[PDB]
Amino acid sequence: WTNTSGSCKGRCFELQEVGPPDCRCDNLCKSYSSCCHDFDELCLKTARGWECTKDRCGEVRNEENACHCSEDCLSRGDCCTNYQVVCKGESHWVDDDCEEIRVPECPAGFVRPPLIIFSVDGFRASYMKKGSKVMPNIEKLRSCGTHAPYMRPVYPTKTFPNLYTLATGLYPESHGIVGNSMYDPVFDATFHLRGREKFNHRWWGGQPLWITATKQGVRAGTFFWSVSIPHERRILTILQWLSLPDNERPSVYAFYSEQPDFSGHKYGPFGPEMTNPLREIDKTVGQLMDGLKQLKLHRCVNVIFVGDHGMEDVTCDRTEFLSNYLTNVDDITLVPGTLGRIRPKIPNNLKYDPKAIIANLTCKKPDQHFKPYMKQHLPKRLHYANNRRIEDLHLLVERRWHVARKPCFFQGDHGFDNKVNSMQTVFVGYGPTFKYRTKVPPFENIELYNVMCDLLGLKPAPNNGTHGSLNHLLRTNTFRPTLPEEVSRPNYPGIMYLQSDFDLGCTCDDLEEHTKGSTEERHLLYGRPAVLYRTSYDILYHTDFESGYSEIFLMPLWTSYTISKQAEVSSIPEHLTNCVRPDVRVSPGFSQNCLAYKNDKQMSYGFLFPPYLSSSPEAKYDAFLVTNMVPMYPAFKRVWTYFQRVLVKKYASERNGVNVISGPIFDYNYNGLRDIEDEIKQYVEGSSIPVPTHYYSIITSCLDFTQPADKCDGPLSVSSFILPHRPDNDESCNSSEDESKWVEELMKMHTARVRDIEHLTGLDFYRKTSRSYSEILTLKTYLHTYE
Numbered sequence: 001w002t003n004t005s006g007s008c009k010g011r012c013f014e015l016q017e018v019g020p021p022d023c024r025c026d027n028l029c030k031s032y033s034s035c036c037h038d039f040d041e042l043c044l045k046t047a048r049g050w051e052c053t054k055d056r057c058g059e060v061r062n063e064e065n066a067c068h069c070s071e072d073c074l075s076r077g078d079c080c081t082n083y084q085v086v087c088k089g090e091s092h093w094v095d096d097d098c099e100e101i102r103v104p105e106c107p108a109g110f111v112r113p114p115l116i117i118f119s120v121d122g123f124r125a126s127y128m129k130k131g132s133k134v135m136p137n138i139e140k141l142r143s144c145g146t147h148a149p150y151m152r153p154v155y156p157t158k159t160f161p162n163l164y165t166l167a168t169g170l171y172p173e174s175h176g177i178v179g180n181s182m183y184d185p186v187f188d189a190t191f192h193l194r195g196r197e198k199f200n201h202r203w204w205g206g207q208p209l210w211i212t213a214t215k216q217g218v219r220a221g222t223f224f225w226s227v228s229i230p231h232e233r234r235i236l237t238i239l240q241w242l243s244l245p246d247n248e249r250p251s252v253y254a255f256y257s258e259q260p261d262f263s264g265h266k267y268g269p270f271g272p273e274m275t276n277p278l279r280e281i282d283k284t285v286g287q288l289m290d291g292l293k294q295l296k297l298h299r300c301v302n303v304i305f306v307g308d309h310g311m312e313d314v315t316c317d318r319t320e321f322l323s324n325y326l327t328n329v330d331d332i333t334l335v336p337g338t339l340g341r342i343r344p345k346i347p348n349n350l351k352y353d354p355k356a357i358i359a360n361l362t363c364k365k366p367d368q369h370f371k372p373y374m375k376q377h378l379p380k381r382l383h384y385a386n387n388r389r390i391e392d393l394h395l396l397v398e399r400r401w402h403v404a405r406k407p408c409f410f411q412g413d414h415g416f417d418n419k420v421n422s423m424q425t426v427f428v429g430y431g432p433t434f435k436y437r438t439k440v441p442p443f444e445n446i447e448l449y450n451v452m453c454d455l456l457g458l459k460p461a462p463n464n465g466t467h468g469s470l471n472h473l474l475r476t477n478t479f480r481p482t483l484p485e486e487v488s489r490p491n492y493p494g495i496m497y498l499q500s501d502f503d504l505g506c507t508c509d510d511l512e513e514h515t516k517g518s519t520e521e522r523h524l525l526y527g528r529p530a531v532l533y534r535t536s537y538d539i540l541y542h543t544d545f546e547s548g549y550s551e552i553f554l555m556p557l558w559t560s561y562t563i564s565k566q567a568e569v570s571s572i573p574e575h576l577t578n579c580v581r582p583d584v585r586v587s588p589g590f591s592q593n594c595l596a597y598k599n600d601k602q603m604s605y606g607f608l609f610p611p612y613l614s615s616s617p618e619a620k621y622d623a624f625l626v627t628n629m630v631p632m633y634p635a636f637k638r639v640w641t642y643f644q645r646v647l648v649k650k651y652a653s654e655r656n657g658v659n660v661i662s663g664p665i666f667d668y669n670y671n672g673l674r675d676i677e678d679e680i681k682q683y684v685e686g687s688s689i690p691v692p693t694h695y696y697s698i699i700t701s702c703l704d705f706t707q708p709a710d711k712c713d714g715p716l717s718v719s720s721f722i723l724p725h726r727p728d729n730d731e732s733c734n735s736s737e738d739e740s741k742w743v744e745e746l747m748k749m750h751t752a753r754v755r756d757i758e759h760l761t762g763l764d765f766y767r768k769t770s771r772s773y774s775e776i777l778t779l780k781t782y783l784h785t786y787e
Ligand SMILES: *[C@@H]1O[C@H](CO)[C@@H](O[C@@H]2O[C@H](CO)[C@@H](O[C@@H]3O[C@H](CO[C@H]4O[C@H](CO)[C@@H](O)[C@H](O[C@H]5O[C@H](CO)[C@@H](O)[C@H](O)[C@@H]5O[C@H]5O[C@H](CO)[C@@H](O)[C@H](O)[C@@H]5O)[C@@H]4O)[C@@H](O)[C@H](O)[C@@H]3O)[C@H](O)[C@H]2NC(C)=O)[C@H](O)[C@H]1NC(C)=O
Pocket: 170, 171, 173, 174, 175, 176, 202, 203, 204, 205, 206, 383, 386, 387, 388, 462, 463, 464, 671, 672, 673, 759
């Protein structure tokens, strides 16, 4: 209980940790009905508005006023933000020219540049194009500071998951806020936008920036503001806190606005009604920068201007209804709209039939505007499966559409797949620690927590950013990364066996009379991947490829090869169709066997280096080695053969050659991390040959396309995929057609970062290059989006 009778005199917005039964005066008290009775009279002054006027200049200080224009206000720290402009012939910050900030210019008593995070909700990246005509203060920050053309949010692209990802560096499946609404089957409790449950700390995982700061002795201003505190008051409060005594002043601050999200929902992102809220946000940035200038802090503080997600055109007329597909929608609960999550209405209802539901939702209308997925089948790049709050059945919804259970005040919405263009949002950093007038490539919001820790001198808690990948945003305070240590060194087996030693069931129609040589220099362009876990594997060399063959998983961990721009594609000769060859370098006991494949009526096999790309008819025989074989369902072979036979050469032709590394991934427990042996759950029939859940490929070339991939001087260009290894093509509605009509569409959906592959394989790539380690970390976080 809270003793309301207390008072907020000289307590306004205090940074005091104060609770039961004492009444509060802090920026969150209203949200807890815990404010002293006079909080609103003393702390939320509104009198005479937010701007000094010429008449008020040198007034007698009335403490009833929202802000002051009296002679004393400046050292007191509570001037209106335009005080000096109106009353002292100063210029607005926006009217001053940009000048480089080479070191911080902070008042005596400041030991580090403060960080202010200015977050804006639903700020679509493309709004920045409106430029200084609409948002001159923001445009100054953008042009003079360090800006990305956009920042990628996390999925789902809604507020709670994204704000908490920004604060923690974690994917939602890890921090726990997997939605704006969620059901937790263990709590048997429901988190809603509206209401009290969300205040319970049990929902919120990981460690947010303000906690990391506090635990390391850095004072944070309170990040959250009760919704009733107006933006102008939030700015005045931040400015007041910055004027505190050296022993009280915080080092990190956050401002938040619900705009332009609110207006985007009402009017849509391209509505003329959007100009006004963008102007209002810019005005707020203006007040902040004018205020900082009056305090002599505009060349001292680092400012981050960042959004949570964008906004798409979505209206009532574009709604799919589950009742058009399913007979009894009254028995399910749907988290609806721009994504779908389905569970039974009655928790654990034994009559719930998810396989039947998914069957009725799969490719049932030719224009269908969503696609069902069991969560383990969602693109791995979404990282959206490893949490009990994520329903098994998910609907990925097409941009511009809604999905609803059964049968207009809105024109915009968000929540869609985070690679969708309209979902991208904004990042600008301005201040002494950021670079001056620098554009940087788009990057993901999970990376910002490490950077904010760097800006504040903090050691980040374990998170999903790749620390160092954003060093190029910073003038100083960079993080020096260190290459992870190789755990398992390879073996280099020679010939140790005779064809006679092998009883595998393999046959091939293949003068009786494979050294390293230049294999590595040609086919392994960036060094051998390091194996970061304890295991046993062999380097195997060939004319056309090299591989790291695992003696434990009975297949290559990786297979590396380079295809020139001019390379020749050739067939598999009829007499070699079923050819599999024993590999005399590897024990028969560490080899697969063709009999398992014969016996398994559902499982077939494929190859990592494709016979289609062999350099000569004799080199082609290497491609049929048992050590180049992997288990593949026929459905998957449709994709894989098309990739191997058509696409790789297409990429080589377009990129002036390519280097490919391909391989298996085991993620049976869908946690985005390499499985240990115990976690593998499927084997080829009658064998101990494990079945990959996915196959990856990493395709690298020279960023300067005028240079061949094998003679590249400078930066690299990479695209990668993590393809789901599935027994059917139900995901691809057009799969009955020729592969030229559907395979590339599937691959684009399952694009991936090299970093994603590293997590899933326990491998570390690009260890031997001419680039810096920070540059390589940037490369490994790149996602080719195809938008
Ligand atoms: C993205 O980055 C994160 C952070 O590094 C990685 O997540 C970590 O994965 C490791 C390895 O699997 C886990 O280690 C296990 O730790 C547990 C003990 O964990 C408890 O203590 C830690 C430390 O305080 C705490 O962080 C954990 O928090 C989890 O559980 C809370 C209560 O249920 C929950 O509120 C919180 O949101 C978080 O849940 C998430 O993780 C759990 C697994 O622990 C998972 O079931 C759940 O669905 C969420 O995903 C927890 O209280 C030991 O017993 C084990 O032996 C093992 O050491 C870390 O716990 C985990 N950290 C976090 C914060 O999730 C991700 O792998 C990485 N993703 C990718 C793709 O690289």
